[PDB]
Amino acid sequence: VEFIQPPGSLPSEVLHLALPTSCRPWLPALAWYLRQNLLIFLHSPKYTDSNSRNHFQHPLPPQPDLDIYLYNKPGGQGTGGKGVACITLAFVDSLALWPDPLREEEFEQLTQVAPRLRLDVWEKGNISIVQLEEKLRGAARQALADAIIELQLLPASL
Numbered sequence: 001v002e003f004i005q006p007p008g009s010l011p012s013e014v015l016h017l018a019l020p021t022s023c024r025p026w027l028p029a030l031a032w033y034l035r036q037n038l039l040i041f042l043h044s045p046k047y048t049d050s051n052s053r054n055h056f057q058h059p060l061p062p063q064p065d066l067d068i069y070l071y072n073k074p075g076g077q078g079t080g081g082k083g084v085a086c087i088t089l090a091f092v093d094s095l096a097l098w099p100d101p102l103r104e105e106e107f108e109q110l111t112q113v114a115p116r117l118r119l120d121v122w123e124k125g126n127i128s129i130v131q132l133e134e135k136l137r138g139a140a141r142q143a144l145a146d147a148i149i150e151l152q153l154l155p156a157s158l
Contacts (some may be wrong), residue, residue: 001047001056004084004124010059012085012123015133017140021114023147027093031148036142037143043070045086056086059120063095067123069131081126089119101152109147113141 023030031055042140045056045068056068088140093115119136123129 001049001054001084003119005057005086007057010057010122011120011130013120014128015119015121015136016087017113017117017119017146018138019113019115019117019140020110022110023144024115025098026147026151027091027115028098029151030144031091031095033088033143033147033150034140037139037146038069039074040139043072044111045070057122058086060088060090063090063145071121071127073124073126074128075126082124083127084124085121085127087119087121091115091117111141111145113137114142 047054049055054069058068060066060067066088069085069089071083071085071087073083116138
């Protein structure tokens with residue numbers, strides 16, 4: 001774990017994601033959706049480690065909970081490289097203190113991407129940070145859309 005993680009230099013440059021303020025009231029639920037929607041190719045930061053020190057270093061205090069994100073190295077035929085990290089992202093300008101319809105033609109306003117979402121990882125080489133950033137943007141947008149469809153469209157009865 002520490003081979004790819006530079007414990008002194010925690011980040012591999014920062015990544016801040018800006019979310020619409022309209023999603024502020026339901027901040028924690030979104031997190032769960034994110035904590036779900038990210039786990040497509042992301043893998044849990046769990047190993048044969050009966051200690052938090054053996055687990056990947058997390059330069060992000062909890063908002064016992066929380067975890068990090070691990071990405072396997074992509075590549076294969078043609079383009080390739082060695083990429084591994086431990087991303088411990090958080091939302092800041094704290095969801096612990098946290099517990100009319102909208103039109104269609106005026107949509108994409110709530111889906112446009114006021115709490116920011118800071119992200120920092122420990123890069124291990126060939127990562128193509130632009131691809132990871134756009135993947136993060138898309139995943140966050142999908143998770144927010146899922147949370148919206150669950151919060152407001154679902155409870156309506158026929």
